[PDB]
């Protein structure tokens, strides 16, 4: 069965990856782009920006392990271990010449390590909305002038007894509607059909519990990227941040050019953090014309 | 009936403050000392303190608003509006004398507005354990290398669509003893008799939502206290906080030294948030012998 339509033109598949069954959606011809969602969504958030992308590449969106589709990982939820599978899965299908890597949210924990492990494996890299793990997100603050903070949700999910799972369980349809819009400034573009389909696949038992192992890992993510990030980025990068409610803003850009050599970052107004949905015009414009130089 | 099991020498009554029937216990002989418990608790907390204090003072232990067995705020949940009703309900039993204040967590929120207006009224005061509210808790990280941070509650409690009650409608047992437990350094002073107590409490429905208005009016108050704070506390103060998991450490006495002229801590090691359960000799001690001099 599949949890979301797939575009036209474009196959539902599987493929075991040491030992665990990724599910990914797959099209068009040309050079590899790798698309790796967030928290709260799958493949499906890339659906508007695959089709223009399979004119010109080939296009593979997985679900993330546990998520969507997508087996638990057998080894971690850690950014290193995580990305074995992404990188793996990846050179399975461009096995002789680089790839692109566009990834957003919790996509980029679980491709940083990969991509700063085989930099000559990445042709070009596009990221959005969250901040690599390091000491930086140490310093977010719990609560704001305006009211709640942006990822205060980072403790929450990483509170053990499984506080997240235990208070969401039966009610994980009102949450994603409440995370989801908490964290968009164009939030109209947020149906009940389309969080309908969004909450149908992370309620599913395993994908909760997932979800947010993500989180319980995150801080040993940030001891492993205190190694790996000795050695800067030399593939040409583009950060994107929301500028509205939910976005990122400056920090997007100012946290890669210490992991970067070569970035151009972009703010986009009036929109938060769910870009693919709240301003596909001009980011799938962004995408387009940075993977097609 | 009686949530709490009231002492022996004390009454469980009812005062109507400004159309709010306010509920309180009340013991002892002498000049007036207030109680002011905090969120998860009810008078209760002071249940070892208060056959101690009141065998030099009469003592009052009131339930916040909306809390335990008191009637919600008919005005508003900020702490200039809630401190009227502690003002005056404090004024009706002792009329013609100034009085003791002793206040634990956002009792401090809600008594900080009444003492600086009403300094003459105040013989000496007593806070322990949160800030007042003001731009510093805008510092407070929400996440650290070593899991969950000490306030990532205060933007779940003051989110928007009930976000709160929500979740923890159902799970009320389970929600507290861990946010108990997550703020404790000793938590076997919390017997499972306890923490069915508070949880039976506080999970009445309206109690349940007033917890939380509380915090959904916090920077109401912060911005209240902005102006307030131009007059400085005259009256001998101390502060207490634990020194262990969950405590505040250096900082609530760090920051009564702007608030107040005349100002005395401690730093309580071995001891978490709950002081007058997880700490109560010593914490009965340094709160009697400073009101007894
Ligand atoms: C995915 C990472 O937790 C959600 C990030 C929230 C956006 C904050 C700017
Ligand atoms: C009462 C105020 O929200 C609980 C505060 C605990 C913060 C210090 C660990």
Redesign the interface.
Known sequence: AEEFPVPNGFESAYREVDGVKLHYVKGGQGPLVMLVHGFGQTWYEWHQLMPELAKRFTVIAPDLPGLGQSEPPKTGYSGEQVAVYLHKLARQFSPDRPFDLVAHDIGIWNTYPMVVKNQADIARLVYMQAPIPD?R?????????????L??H???F????R?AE???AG?ER??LE?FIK?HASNTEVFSERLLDLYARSYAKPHSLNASFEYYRA??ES?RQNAELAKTRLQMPTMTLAGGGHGGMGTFQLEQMKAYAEDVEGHVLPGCGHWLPEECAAPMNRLVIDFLSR
């Open positions: 000491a997100i140490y310093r977010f603050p719990a609560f704001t002038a305006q009211g709640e903070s990822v205060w980072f403790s929450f990483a509170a053990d007894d506080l235990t208070l969401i009610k009102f949450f409440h908490s995150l801080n940030v």
